[PDB]
Amino acid sequence: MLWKKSLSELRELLKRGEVSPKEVVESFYDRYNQTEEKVKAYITPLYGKALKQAESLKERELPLFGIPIAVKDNILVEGEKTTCASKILENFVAPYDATVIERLKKAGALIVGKTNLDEFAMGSSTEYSAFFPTKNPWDLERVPGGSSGGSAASVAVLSAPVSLGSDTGGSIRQPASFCGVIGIKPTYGRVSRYGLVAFASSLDQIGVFGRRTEDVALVLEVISGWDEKDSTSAKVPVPEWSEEVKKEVKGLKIGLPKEFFEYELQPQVKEAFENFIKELEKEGFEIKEVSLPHVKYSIPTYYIIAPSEASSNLARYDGVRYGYRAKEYKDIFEMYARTRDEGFGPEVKRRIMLGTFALSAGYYDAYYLKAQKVRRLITNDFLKAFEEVDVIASPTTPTLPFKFGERLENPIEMYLSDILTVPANLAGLPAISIPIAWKDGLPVGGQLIGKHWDETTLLQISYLWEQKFKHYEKIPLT
Amino acid sequence: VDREWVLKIAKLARLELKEEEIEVFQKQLSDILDFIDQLKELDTENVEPYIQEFEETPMREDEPHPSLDREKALMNAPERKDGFFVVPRVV
Amino acid sequence: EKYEAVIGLEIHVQMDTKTKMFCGCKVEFGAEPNTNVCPVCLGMPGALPIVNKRAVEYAIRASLALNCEVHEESVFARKHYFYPDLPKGYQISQYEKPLATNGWVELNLPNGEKKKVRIRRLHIEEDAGKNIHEGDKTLVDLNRAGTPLMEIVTEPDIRTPEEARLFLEKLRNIMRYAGVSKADMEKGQLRCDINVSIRPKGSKEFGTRVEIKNVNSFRFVQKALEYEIERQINVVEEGGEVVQETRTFDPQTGKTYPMRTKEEAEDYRYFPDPDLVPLKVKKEWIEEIKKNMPELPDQRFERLIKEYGLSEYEAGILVNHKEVGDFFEEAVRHFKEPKGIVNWLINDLLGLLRDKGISIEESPVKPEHLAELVKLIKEKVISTKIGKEVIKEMVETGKTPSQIVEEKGL
Numbered sequence: 010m011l012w013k014k015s016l017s018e019l020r021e022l023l024k025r026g027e028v029s030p031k032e033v034v035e036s037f038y039d040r041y042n043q044t045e046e047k048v049k050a051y052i053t054p055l056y057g058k059a060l061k062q063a064e065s066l067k068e069r070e071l072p073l074f075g076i077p078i079a080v081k082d083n084i085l086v087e088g089e090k091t092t093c094a095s096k097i098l099e100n101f102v103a104p105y106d107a108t109v110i111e112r113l114k115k116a117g118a119l120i121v122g123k124t125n126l127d128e129f130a131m132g133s134s135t136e137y138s139a140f141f142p143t144k145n146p147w148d149l150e151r152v153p154g155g156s157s158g159g160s161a162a163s164v165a166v167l168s169a170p171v172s173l174g175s176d177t178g179g180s181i182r183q184p185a186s187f188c189g190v191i192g193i194k195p196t197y198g199r200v201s202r203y204g205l206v207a208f209a210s211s212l213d214q215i216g217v218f219g220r221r222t223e224d225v226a227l228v229l230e231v232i233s234g235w236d237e238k239d240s241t242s243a244k245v246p247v248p249e250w251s252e253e254v255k256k257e258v259k260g261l262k263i264g265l266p267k268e269f270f271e272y273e274l275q276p277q278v279k280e281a282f283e284n285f286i287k288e289l290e291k292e293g294f295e296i297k298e299v300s301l302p303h304v305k306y307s308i309p310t311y312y313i314i315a316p317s318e319a320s321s322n323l324a325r326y327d328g329v330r331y332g333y334r335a336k337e338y339k340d341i342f343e344m345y346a347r348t349r350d351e352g353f354g355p356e357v358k359r360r361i362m363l364g365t366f367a368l369s370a371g372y373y374d375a376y377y378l379k380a381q382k383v384r385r386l387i388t389n390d391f392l393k394a395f396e397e398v399d400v401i402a403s404p405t406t407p408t409l410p411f412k413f414g415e416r417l418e419n420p421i422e423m424y425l426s427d428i429l430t431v432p433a434n435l436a437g438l439p440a441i442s443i444p445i446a447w448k449d450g451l452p453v454g455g456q457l458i459g460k461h462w463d464e465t466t467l468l469q470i471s472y473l474w475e476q477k478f479k480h481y482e483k484i485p486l487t
Numbered sequence: 488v489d490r491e492w493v494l495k496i497a498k499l500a501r502l503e504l505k506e507e508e509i510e511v512f513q514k515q516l517s518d519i520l521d522f523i524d525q526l527k528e529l530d531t532e533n534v535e536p537y538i539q540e541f542e543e544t545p546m547r548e549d550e551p552h553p554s555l556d557r558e559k560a561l562m563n564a565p566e567r568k569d570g571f572f573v574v575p576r577v578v
Numbered sequence: 579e580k581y582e583a584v585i586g587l588e589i590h591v592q593m594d595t596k597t598k599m600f601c602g603c604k605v606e607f608g609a610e611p612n613t614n615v616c617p618v619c620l621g622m623p624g625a626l627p628i629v630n631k632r633a634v635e636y637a638i639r640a641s642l643a644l645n646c647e648v649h650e651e652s653v654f655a656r657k658h659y660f661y662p663d664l665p666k667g668y669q670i671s672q673y674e675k676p677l678a679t680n681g682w683v684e685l686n687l688p689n690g691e692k693k694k695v696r697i698r699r700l701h702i703e704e705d706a707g708k709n710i711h712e713g714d715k716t717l718v719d720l721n722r723a724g725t726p727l728m729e730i731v732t733e734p735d736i737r738t739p740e741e742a743r744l745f746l747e748k749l750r751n752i753m754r755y756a757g758v759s760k761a762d763m764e765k766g767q768l769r770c771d772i773n774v775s776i777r778p779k780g781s782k783e784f785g786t787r788v789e790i791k792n793v794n795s796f797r798f799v800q801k802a803l804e805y806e807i808e809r810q811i812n813v814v815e816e817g818g819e820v821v822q823e824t825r826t827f828d829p830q831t832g833k834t835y836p837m838r839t840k841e842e843a844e845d846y847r848y849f850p851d852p853d854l855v856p857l858k859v860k861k862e863w864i865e866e867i868k869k870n871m872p873e874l875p876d877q878r879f880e881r882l883i884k885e886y887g888l889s890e891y892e893a894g895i896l897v898n899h900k901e902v903g904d905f906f907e908e909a910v911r912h913f914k915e916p917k918g919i920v921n922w923l924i925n926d927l928l929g930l931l932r933d934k935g936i937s938i939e940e941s942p943v944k945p946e947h948l949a950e951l952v953k954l955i956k957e958k959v960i961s962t963k964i965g966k967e968v969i970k971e972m973v974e975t976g977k978t979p980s981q982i983v984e985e986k987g988l
């Protein structure tokens with residue numbers, strides 16, 4: 010049905026003129042119109058604009074020639090609103106393109122819309138979007154995850170085939186898990202953060218959602234690589250991932266962290282994960298218990314580091330150069346303090362307060378500096394475990410997709426969604442969430458954490474898993 | 488943690504909290520501060536704070552790049568005048 | 579006098595780079611508001627800083643010229659505060675782990691004695707923009723935001739308003755000789771905040787500190803200090819305690835004033851900018867900058883005294899205004915009569931250019947013309963009396979000495 014087709018199916022059709030870019034966009038546009046009222050994946054749909062851009066698109070040999078792509082609304086797309094799902098940035102028109110958007114555009118991709126998120130990418134459910142909640146296409150009483158809720162969701166309903174999100178502490182993987190889709194956050198430094206509205210600079214990474222491992226491997230290859238506009242982007246050559254996913258490496262090893270046994274899992278998740286591992290064992294993977302003596306400290310560490318960097322990075326939203334400004338004020342001080350109280354959502358305001366505390370002199374040593382040290386302890390656990398094993402596996406999430414309002418009561422209950430996801434951001438490691446089962450009607454994600462720069466292996470295992478378990482065929486909303 | 492504390496931190500952060508928020512953020516922040524207080528247990532004398540690996544500091548040649556068009560630089564501005572960003576007067 | 583003044587200075591020096599500290603926008607004076615500006619230097623969402631290599635190179639050179647220990651690893655830190663001229667809500671500078679530390683400047687005092695003022699630190703940081711007030715509004719130009727600065731902090735080693743000025747003059751001259759900054763207060767290239775306390779003579783304890791901000795010339799720092807020292811001595815001997823505050827200086831009145839606003843400073847919430855890796859400075863690069871260091875004023879001073887046999891009065895003039903020494907040496911090259919050339923340069927040309935209000939870089943009399951004129955005086959082609967008549971018209975016209983000798987008869 011066209012929107013039902015993968016990028017391989019679409020590429021062959023586009024290369025031989027059997028279809029045009031415009032038709033592709035039209036197809037997904039329809040599926041968008043079918044789904045959007047229920048799902049609410051987008052803040053700013055740009056199918057209209059992509060239609061027009063498609064007419065002038067002609068060179069077919071471009072790696073992403075006719076491909077529609079949704080983009081999270083904390084990644085700048087020039088000339089269109091980048092809201093970060095915030096009141097403080099509604100009506101902010103992006104004056105420049107994120108480096109990844111430049112690279113996709115150059116590769117023929119067609120940006121089809123700006124995707125909903127937790128405000129400033131802080132949250133695990135998308136409920137903190139200042140505008141409206143995005144809903145899980147497999148059960149609209151359920152959350153799609155966060156913060157990249159809309160990017161996961163739209164890939165799930167196939168209102169777009171492939172999608173960009175960002176991952177500070179699980180913001181691609183978790184949503185991938187919840188929406189029954191593939192989602193990867195590459196090694197810290199693999200993809201530029203130029204044009205990515207910064208949350209936690211030392212933790213943020215753009216990543217990719219898709220339904221087929223090749224789709225994800227190609228979009229990632231396109232957007233990855235050194236950027237001169239980003240000091241933290243690595244000068245490391247990008248592997249030819251599209252040619253590499255399909256290969257098979259013999260005698261790989263999987264680590265099951267002993268410390269993860271102590272983690273409260275829903276029985277359905279536990280069952281699905283055990284089966285994922287048994288089935289991988291059958292295919293010849295060696296399965297080993299590993300130790301990460303410090304992982305349990307990941308959450309506390311993250312919820313000191315992330316808020317801290319966030320209070321710093323959000324200092325700039327001030328009513329002076331752009332965005333929202335309060336209407337009533339007697340002073341510059343009031344202008345500042347009113348603009349911000351009114352423009353920022355509650356979770357954001359919470360991490361700002363916590364952050365400016367953790368950086369305050371007198372508390373910096375016991376808070377942020379301490380956390381950055383424990384962070385090295387946690388990274389070192391991984392480097393040592395990677396001496397014995399090739400990837401580390403766990404569930405992506407301790408639970409099945411939860412209900413709206415369920416984790417808004419105590420802010421902390423929201424944080425606990427991240428317990429299996431944050432360790433990879435702390436260690437700067439790549440990590441993928443792939444769908445491993447459907448339990449009580451709901452997707453379950455399996456997570457693989459790889460060594461620095463080893464997205465190849467993560468992707469390879471993802472390709473092998475999909476051949477056994479064809480999750481790309483499970484399409485929600487008919 | 489005090490009302491005094493909440494107000495002092497919000498001042499630093501330039502948040503003019505509404506009276507509803509001051510009370511909620513008292514409990515929520517207290518809870519979060521108890522929640523994240525796990526790290527004292529660990530010994531970090533003799534642990535280096537985390538930095539990403541790098542061989543040399545990334546630097547850039549001293550050569551001009553085309554600036555942003557002033558129109559685009561100002562377009563988003565709440566108030567502009569004569570090429571300037573406009574804010575209420577400061578002392 | 580019973581008391582003693584203790585003075586420390588905090589100097590921000592603008593680096594003569596083409597480009598800003600953390601983006602590729604031009605550093606230039608008097609552009610149209612918000613034209614040399616950037617997603618980066620504008621503190622736009624998503625925009626990342628990239629360190630300027632020449633800014634780094636210049637800051638190392640300046641550190642060495644100030645006799646500092648240059649630290650092979652230093653860290654950019656975020657310094658947070660909210661102000662309309664500071665786009666990101668923070669200034670990127672250095673804190674703990676600055677570039678350079680433990681240096682010194684030598685002052686030559688009128689009485690002939692030489693004194694040292696220690697440099698506590700030199701660190702790299704970016705500038706903020708500039709505000710203009712107009713009615714009930716402030717107008718913000720961010721052209722200057724992100725311009726590279728060296729923040730130079732003195733130990734409280736200065737004892738006298740005159741010493742404070744002399745320090746500032748030497749610092750300027752070292753910066754100029756090293757070629758790192760033009761360092762003229764007039765153009766905002768050098769800022770200076772003054773800190774001062776008093777102390778019973780020969781005491782080792784430190785008195786309560788007053789900070790005087792936005793003093794705009796080397797002369798004004800002397801005047802501000804002159805008064806403030808008097809002010810504090812009055813207070814103390816009247817039985818009062820001197821109170822710790824920031825004050826302002828009015829050039830028109832020559833007085834220092836407390837501020838109407840009891841606004842205390844706020845925690846800067848310092849931490850390493852996570853957009854940047856540590857500044858790692860190879861020993862090999864320090865060595866290379868050390869080996870290729872331009873000549874510095876104290877060195878030049880002894881060299882001229884030797885190479886040309888000038889007096890300490892003469893060489894001092896030539897070294898304190900570098901372009902005068904440069905002129906002299908290019909002239910002495912055309913005609914190897916050093917004694918004759920300094921005479922005619924100092925006693926004649928300099929005063930004639932001053933009167934016409936013209937700098938030595940732009941004088942109609944080129945080093946060739948002075949060397950030529952001094953040739954005619956030495957070789958007895960013309961007399962001193964005639965020589966003084968032709969130099970006046972040389973300045974007036976721009977014609978060679980030989981040109982106007984012919985045009986008017988030998």
Ligand SMILES: Nc1ncnc2c1ncn2[C@@H]1O[C@H](COP(=O)(O)OP(=O)(O)O)[C@@H](O)[C@H]1O
Binds near residue numbers: 587588731773785
């Ligand atoms: N009692 C004092 N009298 C004069 N100058 C002082 C005194 N104390 C500090 N200073 C000067 O003030 C500047 C910095 O002061 P300091 O208190 O050391 O750092 P800061 O106040 O910037 O954190 C230095 O130039 C130092 O010499």
Ligand SMILES: [Mg+2]
Binds near residue numbers: 590703729
């Ligand atoms: Mg400074």
Ligand SMILES: [Zn+2]
Binds near residue numbers: 614617618
């Ligand atoms: Zn710039």
